[PDB]
Design a protein around this ligand. Structure first.
Ligand SMILES: [Cl-]
Ligand SMILES: [Zn+2]
Lengths: 109, 109
């Protein structure tokens, strides 16, 4: 969501946009690496539960991988938000900051 | 999604249903506590970014709180899934499991 709202809501000149597209590829690779771990953990959970519907060491280990991936996703998104900010011209950063802060405060309500 | 996928697709006896509704209460309170911490963390992030838009110690600490709440929500959900299962008659567990297992499979693809 946060990732989504910022993407739309700030105007970019051609130089900013060129750089932000590169940063978006970088973020896409990171998000895909995390999603891959998440999918594998989910497969491990499916396997374990189909075999034995109890909280086995296999379920515990897979759950830890899910927890980690869920955390990594949030951190990666926040890091990416600051990376995009760094791609903007100084004079464009206040507009970005307003949207970011607003989005975050709507998330504290 | 999971807690919701399972709920929307299971035949709830009668005495089972009363019990599931009870556990839907205890879990919902647990979700509410986790959400509270997440909103708080977001609030800290908005506050920090307004004072200084940078990866400061406050941003790092708040991000960590977000990561942990994200992880906690996944673990709590899974525990609740096993909780609801324990309450079902033996005859009713296969349908529940196949909804749960398929969901996790989908989440691996
Ligand atoms: Cl990360
Ligand atoms: Zn992006």
């Amino acid at each position: 969501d946060l990732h989504e709202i910022l993407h739309e809501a700030v105007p970019l000149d051609a130089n900013e946009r060129e750089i932000l597209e590169l940063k978006e590829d970088a973020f896409a690779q990171r998000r895909r690496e995390i999603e891959t771990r998440l999918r594998a953990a989910n497969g491990k959970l499916a396997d374990a539960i189909a075999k034995n519907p109890a909280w086995s060491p296999e379920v515990e280990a897979a759950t830890q991988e899910v927890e980690r991936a869920a955390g990594d996703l949030q951190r990666a998104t926040l890091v990416h938000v600051f990376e995009m900010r760094a791609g903007l011209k100084p004079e464009h950063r206040p507009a970005y900051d307003r949207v970011l802060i607003d989005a975050l405060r709507r998330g504290s309500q």
